[PDB]
Homo-oligomer: A and B are copies of this chain.
Amino acid sequence: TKITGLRTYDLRFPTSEGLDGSDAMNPDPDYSAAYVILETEGTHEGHGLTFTIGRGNEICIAAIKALGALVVGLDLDWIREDMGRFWRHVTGDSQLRWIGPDKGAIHLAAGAVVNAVWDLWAKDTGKPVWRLVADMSPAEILRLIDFRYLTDVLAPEEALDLLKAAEPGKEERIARLIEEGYPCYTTSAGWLGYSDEKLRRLCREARAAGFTHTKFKVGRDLSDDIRRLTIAREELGEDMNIMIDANQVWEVDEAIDWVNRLAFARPLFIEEPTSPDDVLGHKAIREGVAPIKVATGEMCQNRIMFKQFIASGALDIVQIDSCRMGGLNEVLAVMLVAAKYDLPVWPHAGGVGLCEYVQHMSMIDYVAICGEKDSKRIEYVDHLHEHFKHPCIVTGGAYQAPHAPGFSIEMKEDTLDAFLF
């Protein structure tokens, strides 16, 4: 099997029409996918995307096309033999690196391309991605990862030790996953643009559905946030776990003051209180708002930044995103760093196809990395699942384990035509 070509689609969805996804930083996102198909001579094609919120999607498309020169002509077997080597290769064009390195449009594109390869690999072997990786031995999983710029915090030997320690319980955990699924929380009642009445209704829906955890956007107006969280608590009840997300908007001192003003709502954590680059900033905020925890990561650019967030104790909750960084391989590296420091990973899913991706990622984390899921929650949003051949399935507050071969990301063909920008 050889990758023989690739096609790209600039897909944009009119989510702003109802302000779905609206938050303190992004008032009117148009959920969009920079979508890629890796062509083969065979029966399978590798589908992948990276997620943006409208304008700028075409910049990612440009970056995907550039990466295409590194991938077209490759043999899939060469890729599979040492995917860490492939990852170094695909992120290793020094000229393309200059556009990053491993950040912004070029790394968003890498996420799409890398995840497309996983889709292809999984389809070829007849396994959902979570199972494809979970079935691997510790050494085989270790081999997936490019450890460059990680070794001062997590060297391959220590990663291998973690993988070996988690190996003996894998079968039981797989069975448990089939029986129970993986618990998730909802942000769908929480978008900042919603009226209070809509907020009330969607809070009742979330509770009725069996979620134990619900997230709300905050950060534009303090008076609004106090009012909204008071109302949320009324509808949700005292037992509900509430979280809040500021989407990066605050300064450090502002953030500490503002979430302390929201302390009455008993939020489990504040998400992205400030810039996603500000490690020392998050750490200062963390100290100032304890016992309210601090979460961040959905825009954390790469493993180098994540390792510093984690090693410096700048956060309580690690929120990887499936295609912000260099796809599954880099996510797995971060999950191992998180496991070394006993920090939970709660993936971001606020976007088109993101749920479809991160379900597999946490399920790998559960089976083969940290071995625990009960105390964690994958993000979930109830938007745009209708465009996927195999959408995630959530009920009673949990993702059902994927069954179809691939990465759950392939879109219905009609969608590829209807939503072309």
Contact = CB atoms under 8 A, between A and B. Distances in A.
A107 interface: yes
Contacts of A312: 280
Interface string A89-114: 00001111111111111111000000
Given A104-B99, A108-B99, A149-B281, A59 B63 contact: yes
Interface residues of A, number: 58
A299 B151 CA distance: 21
A348 to B, nearest CB: 12
Contacts of A151: 251-253
A93 B59 contact: no
A240 interface: no
A365 interface: no
A113 to B, nearest CB: 14
A278 interface: yes
A212 interface: no
B252 A52 contact: no
Contacts of A106: 56, 59, 104-105
Contact of A304 (B27, B96, B108, B275): B275
Nearest to A249: B148
Contacts of A30: 95
Contacts of A54: 95, 98
Contacts of A299: 98, 101
Nearest to A51: B98
Given A104-B105, A106-B104, A96 B56 contact: yes
A152 B98 contact: no
A58 B52 contact: no
Which of A27, A29, A106, A279 has the largest count of B CB atoms less than 10 A from its CB? Answer: A279
A290 interface: no
A83 interface: no
A101 to B, nearest CB: 7
Contact of A278 (B58, B252, B280, B308): B308
Contacts of A27: 94
A104 B100 contact: yes
A336 to B, nearest CB: 17
A384 interface: no
Interface in A252-306: 252-253, 274-281, 284, 299, 301-302, 304-305
A90 to B, nearest CB: 13
A288 to B, nearest CB: 11
Contact of A98 (B52, B102, B149, B253): B52
Given A26-B94, A277-B301, 16 more contacts: A25-B94, A27-B94, A29-B95, A54-B98, A56-B99, A99-B104, A99-B108, A101-B248, A102-B277, A104-B105, A105-B105, A149-B251, A149-B274, A149-B278, A279-B308, A280-B311
27 contacts: A26-B94, A29-B94, A29-B95, A52-B98, A55-B66, A55-B69, A56-B63, A56-B66, A56-B95, A56-B96, A56-B98, A56-B99, A58-B66, A59-B62, A59-B63, A59-B66, A59-B106, A101-B275, A103-B103, A105-B105, A148-B251, A149-B251, A149-B275, A151-B251, A151-B252, A277-B302, A280-B308
Interface of A: 25-27, 29-30, 52-56, 58-60, 62-63, 66, 69, 93-108, 148-149, 151-152, 248, 251-253, 274-281, 284, 299, 301-302, 304-305, 308, 311-312
